[PDB]
Design a protein around this ligand. Structure first.
Ligand SMILES: CCCCCCCCCO[C@@H]1O[C@H](CO)[C@@H](O)[C@H](O)[C@H]1O
Ligand SMILES: CCCCCCCCCO[C@@H]1O[C@H](CO)[C@@H](O)[C@H](O)[C@H]1O
Ligand SMILES: NC(=[NH2+])NCCC[C@H](N)C(=O)O
Ligand SMILES: NC(=[NH2+])NCCC[C@H](N)C(=O)O
Lengths: 423, 423
């Protein structure tokens, strides 16, 4: 019936940011290399800045759930409304990618998991298992995310520690498109604790610490595993198709790296979606409470868990999953990953705008930065949009319009304009 | 020192919507035909609806300048800020296309106007001439726009009246991309009177009448000239390259149609940009007055004309014109026309949202529509975005972020949040 403690929360943030990314990014990145690494560097810096922004903002205002709340204070109910619809959509839509991936990893052990049918079925089942777990509660979901991420660090920490022996000279000059997709994706999760603040005991101290702790851990692992791989698989080796990560895996860990890796990968991927289901429920609840989403989303139980909220998300998730637009259908991760990333960027951007419009004054002698630090978060949000696909940036731009019109229609009486008419 | 009268205003709206479009659209449209006509039909219907929306909204609130004001009341200063930055940008950027076009038309008479140098030079000069005219005033700019559009109707009205004799059977089944560009472009201008309300005597009566009058006239001419051409140039004739409009022109008007047409075309194109320079100055002034743009834009003279405002716009226009991104450089109208159109759509969309959030109550027994009529305006805005280019929709999406961040940075103290902090 109560909230969650620092360590578990901070591991949740670390895990929001990893799960899929840790194993996808370093492989991918080493593989293509060169121009790609700069991109990676840029987005690392941007994520670190954005994290300071969130840290500071959740500090100022320990409200649930993250950017939704900040955008509502900062601008209107309308920007609140919109921020949540976007972020909410992003959380669960992204799950459609992660189930297919994290269950793919276990195909190593259960060959049958590669018949599309079994894959799809097994996928829906796992989605609902994590819905159930969330219904059990934040404590249950968080404990599982915790064990899951640490498990996923075994292989990352391992390759790092034993890649030092094989560490050498670095070919840094040497497709860039889709790596950019993966790299942008791999650093979403910065905002998680801030969004899940309503469900963390002592938000004001715990959340800012948690987000920086989490980002810091995640930043460290990404850089270490990445440099490690670039250093230990040769430049002429880069070529070897289907190689990349797995190569470093076996050479640094034995001929059981297969099992260990495709286990901790799966571990980090699933149970990370446990956390994203959670987060989806939290924005929606946060918003429904203010009357900026339908009220069923605000409907909680004893512990204050939006069970109907989470159940719905389970339903939507499985409709989408069984749809033709799903990775199970298309065998493609670009659409889902892309909208998932871009729908997060608007919340990011409003959060930055929020820090300044809300927390000027609370800056004092340390003002620029913040100013500096946050125009960096701004430039990263822009960077990410510009580096995303045009089709998908357009689909998000359309979604903005649909959301606008939909608020107009669904809230027309009872809105309360900032500068009303008369008569 | 004073304002403008119905007839002139309503001709301005008619001319905002034509100038370039009347001669570009019907040609183009007949040429490609088929699927293209449906697109045309859709956008006609959407523009008619959007016009009812603007008519009703300027009625409710006869404020300057249009959607900027409505968005400010409806949502925050921030949505006000953004609506204006977008619409303001659109007005003058679009001018870069129109000068090159409308001066092109006079190349018929002055062959030299086809050396790129002379073309460019002549272009900047004409831009400034219309800046001057605006500085003389709204009355001067409007009178010129008036004579200009009526002149441009001579050829349209003519082809219509004498295309009835040649009217026959219609091949309606038969690239679609760029026609869609032209058709979307050709119906921008609906919002003009509403934006130029601050400078029209008796806004509340005059403006709603003006916008419907203007749209109505424009709607009529587009449909008449278009059906006329489709009916009088044969299906096998459709092919004939460089033909299209000119064919119908000569066959319905003599072997001087060349002069008459490339004169009234030029007429409608230039002096339409007189009106767009005006409109640019009006949004900026409207906004600067509320402290949502720099104050120089609010700086008026005796008659209350933002001379520095308009001069600046002249400067920006000529920087852009002499830039590599200009039609003088690229020989292409897609970029400029596209951003010009998409930057208008967000103002449209917020205006629709505004009508409902502001004017519920003032609907009474006639409520749905409005509801109906305005979800149509909504669907048209979405339609236009979706039918635009992905690159350019993305550039507009980025611009949104730049505008957001820029408001954050430039207004952080003094903003006044809807739900502030403490301490
Ligand atoms: C309620 C949980 C189970 C409901 C769904 C049962 C599995 C449906 C089959 O899956 C799909 O079958 C298509 C037909 O071959 C494949 O083309 C596709 O790859 C695969 O995605
Ligand atoms: C202040 C008004 C006049 C200032 C600008 C003078 C004209 C500059 C030349 O124009 C440009 O010259 C380029 C070089 O050839 C061409 O490639 C291009 O097509 C054309 O756009
Ligand atoms: N459902 C989601 N929105 N997931 C986002 C995942 C992003 C994260 N950086 C990862 O690699 O896993
Ligand atoms: N500068 C501008 N924004 N011009 C818009 C022009 C659109 C109008 N429908 C036309 O055909 O001329």
């Amino acid at each position: 019936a109560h909230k969650v403690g620092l360590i578990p929360v901070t591991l949740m943030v670390s895990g929001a940011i990893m799960g899929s990314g840790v194993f996808l990014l370093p492989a991918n990145l080493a593989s293509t290399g060169g121009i790609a690494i700069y991109g990676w560097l840029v987005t690392i810096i941007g994520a670190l800045g954005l994290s300071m922004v969130y840290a500071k903002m959740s500090f100022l205002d320990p409200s649930p759930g993250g950017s939704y709340a900040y955008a509502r204070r900062c601008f209107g109910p309308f920007l609140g409304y919109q921020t949540n619809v976007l972020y909410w959509l992003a959380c669960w839509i992204g799950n459609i990618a992660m189930v297919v991936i994290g269950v793919g990893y276990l195909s190593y052990f259960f060959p049958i998991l590669k018949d599309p049918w079994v894959l799809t079925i097994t996928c829906v089942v796992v989605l609902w298992i994590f819905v159930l777990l969330n219904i059990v509660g934040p404590k249950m979901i968080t404990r599982v995310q915790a064990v899951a991420t640490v498990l996923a660090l075994i292989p990352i920490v391992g390759i790092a520690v034993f890649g030092w022996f094989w560490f050498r000279g670095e070919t840094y000059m040497a497709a860039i498109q889709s790596t950019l997709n993966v790299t942008l994706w791999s650093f979403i999760g910065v905002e998680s604790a801030s969004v899940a603040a309503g469900v963390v005991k002592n938000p004001k101290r715990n959340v800012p610490i948690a987000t920086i702790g989490g980002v810091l851990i995640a930043a460290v692992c990404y850089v270490l595993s990445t440099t490690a791989i670039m250093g230990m698989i040769p430049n002429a080796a880069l070529r070897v198709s289907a190689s990349p990560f797995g190569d470093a895996a076996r050479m640094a860990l034995g001929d059981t790296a297969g099992a260990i890796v495709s286990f901790c990968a799966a571990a980090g991927c699933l149970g990370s979606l446990g956390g994203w289901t959670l987060l989806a429920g939290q924005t929606a609840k946060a918003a429904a409470d203010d009357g900026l989403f339908p009220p069923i989303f605000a409907r909680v139980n004893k512990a204050g868990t939006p069970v109907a909220g989470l159940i719905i998300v389970g339903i939507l998730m499985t409709i989408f999953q069984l749809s033709s637009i799903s990775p199970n259908a298309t065998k493609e991760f670009g659409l889902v990953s892309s909208v998932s990333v871009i729908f997060t960027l608007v919340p990011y951007l409003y959060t930055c705008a929020a820090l300044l419009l809300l927390g000027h004054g609370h800056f004092g002698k340390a003002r620029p930065a913040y100013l500096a630090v946050t125009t960096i978060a701004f430039l990263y949000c822009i960077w990410a949009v510009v580096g995303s696909g045009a089709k998908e940036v357009m689909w998000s731009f359309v979604t903005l319009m649909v959301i606008t019109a939909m608020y107009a229609l669904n809230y027309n009486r009872l809105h309360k304009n900032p500068y009303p008419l008369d008569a």
